[PDB]
Design a protein around this ligand. Structure first.
Ligand SMILES: C[C@@H]1O[C@@H](O)[C@H](O)[C@H](O)[C@H]1O
Ligand SMILES: C[C@@H]1O[C@@H](O)[C@H](O)[C@H](O)[C@H]1O
Ligand SMILES: C[C@@H]1O[C@@H](O)[C@H](O)[C@H](O)[C@H]1O
Ligand SMILES: C[C@@H]1O[C@@H](O)[C@H](O)[C@H](O)[C@H]1O
Ligand SMILES: C[C@@H]1O[C@@H](O)[C@H](O)[C@H](O)[C@H]1O
Ligand SMILES: C[C@@H]1O[C@@H](O)[C@H](O)[C@H](O)[C@H]1O
Lengths: 284, 284
């Protein structure tokens, strides 16, 4: 996939649910007259050498990113030349995740037994059918373009952040996305590090050994009762929009970050509930 | 994208024209009961550690590959267990290629000035329109799903193997794939190494410095007159089918290879024409 934006505007990259961005090429500069055309003469090819690393920091491993195509971000690789940002990227399932699959009627049991990586993160999920043989054969199949649009959200609502989760490949969980067709559940998961701080405090994330953070899930709000961050727990469906983007933007590609769990960073998604910041991440 | 095949069968991976295979995950083994099911009890997860490297050798950088899912290829990572091969891959434009673009009416001029890398290889080509602003703006646009299906074949027929090529973004070259819409030409190209041997001789390809071969184009046959491999030149539209696959299969992922230019390797694609083997490749 290719995205292009002119200097001064922002470029949005996105992948479908359960896929992340994998950057192949990036440049801020100019290598064609026909993109963001101005006048007049052709100049020598222009490329900011900084471009790839910056786009990797801003976008790799995320489902979504927005990058400003400006000299402040990239430097100016050719003064007096109207520039543009071009990215070539692929949307892939994260190869750091473990790949599981069971046919309809079975359950997938995930377990994160280690203390340092105790939290399940669901990377990808599909309840339905995307292929025929040799997956879960049955006489009762009429489609290979079947998926609950809810697959990842439901999987995450069941399992995200838990140390153990058993999830049924069943219509009672996901709904039935293709009546009449024998289905399967395909889930990719990772055992993540977890950080949590109560509202009013800071949260520090850390990777050792010259390793770097990739934030996988984050919310400022509350999804649990008062056994987590004792305080008023009236809204347990509370999540600041853009929590993940903010924490990814603060932390991805670094060895340490600190983020304040507070309303001045995330807004207040649930007035009168005592909130916390909970983050799942990996170190690579 | 995901491909799966049971032990004893072959797995075919393919990308559309101008895209190559980029492998994300591979395993020969068993990690699910529901894929290539047999009986009965679940065993511990089974993975050949060899799998990724082998699939990379067989498939990375190619538009197509076919791999036998067998113990001879991978070893046997779990005796007595019916296995399967699963690959997760992405199809991408080769980032080793230079990215060019000009609007309809202009020409793209490619040049390979160095002796050691004197041959143009066209990696990707699209004459048409795949996006709106900020590419080649015009009032006369009614589609962004327009491409000459001939784009890459025509580009290669014009330029492949030359040290200089100037190709017009024009209907007279590619045909008109979207009448009424102002078009552009997007070409990615690389300056390749070239090897050539006349039929009856061998051809050796070589990368220095612990670098490895990736074959980009190959034909056994003839496309030039008798100034190349003097001999009968009656068929100059002569190419053995599967030349590229054979040379990729002999050479990709190695530091040196030798291939005999002869009918016992490639068949005879043009009886009574004196043939040669011509290969473009890169070292990475
Ligand atoms: C044309 C203009 O020239 C200078 O102001 C800067 O180089 C800026 O990035 C460019 O867009
Ligand atoms: C084959 C069978 O048919 C319908 O009953 C349901 O869609 C069910 O989920 C499926 O497994
Ligand atoms: C309990 C308390 O209630 C209000 O002051 C705010 O919503 C604050 O964020 C919360 O912590
Ligand atoms: C079931 C059969 O068992 C042995 O013969 C081998 O391990 C073979 O790979 C497996 O498929
Ligand atoms: C806008 C214009 O319209 C038609 O004449 C042709 O399709 C031509 O290629 C295009 O550039
Ligand atoms: C000229 C000669 O003609 C026949 O013997 C074969 O086609 C051979 O391949 C070719 O080299």
């Amino acid at each position: 996939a290719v995205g292009r934006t002119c200097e001064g505007k922002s470029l949005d990259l996105e992948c479908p649910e359960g896929y992340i961005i994998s950057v192949n090429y990036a440049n801020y500069g100019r290598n064609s007259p026909g993109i963001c055309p101005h006048k007049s003469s052709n100049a020598p090819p222009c490329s900011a050498s900084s471009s790839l690393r910056i786009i990797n920091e801003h976008c790799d491993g995320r489902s979504s990113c927005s990058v400003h195509a400006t000299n402040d971000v990239f430097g100016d690789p050719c003064r007096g030349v109207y520039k543009y940002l071009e990215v070539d990227y692929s949307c892939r399932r994260d190869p750091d995740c473990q790949r599981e699959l069971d046919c309809e009627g079975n359950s997938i049991n995930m377990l994160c037994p280690y203390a340092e990586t105790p939290a399940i993160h669901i990377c990808y999920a599909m309840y339905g059918r995307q292929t025929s043989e040799p997956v879960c054969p049955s006489k009762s199949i009429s489609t290979t373009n079947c998926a609950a649009s809810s697959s990842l959200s439901t999987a995450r609502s069941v399992c995200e952040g838990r140390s153990e989760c058993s999830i049924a490949a069943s219509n009672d969980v996901f709904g039935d996305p293709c009546i009449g067709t024998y289905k399967y559940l395909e889930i990719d998961y990772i055992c993540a590090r977890r950080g949590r701080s109560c509202e009013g405090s800071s949260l520090t994330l850390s990777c050792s050994s010259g390793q770097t953070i990739s934030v996988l899930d984050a919310f400022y709000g509350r999804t649990a009762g008062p056994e987590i961050c004792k305080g008023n727990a009236q809204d347990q469906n509370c999540r600041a929009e853009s929590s993940l983007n903010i924490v990814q933007s603060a932390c991805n590609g670094r060895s340490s970050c600190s983020v304040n769990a507070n309303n001045n960073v995330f807004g207040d998604p649930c007035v009168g509930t005592y909130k916390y910041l909970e983050v799942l991440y990996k170190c690579a």
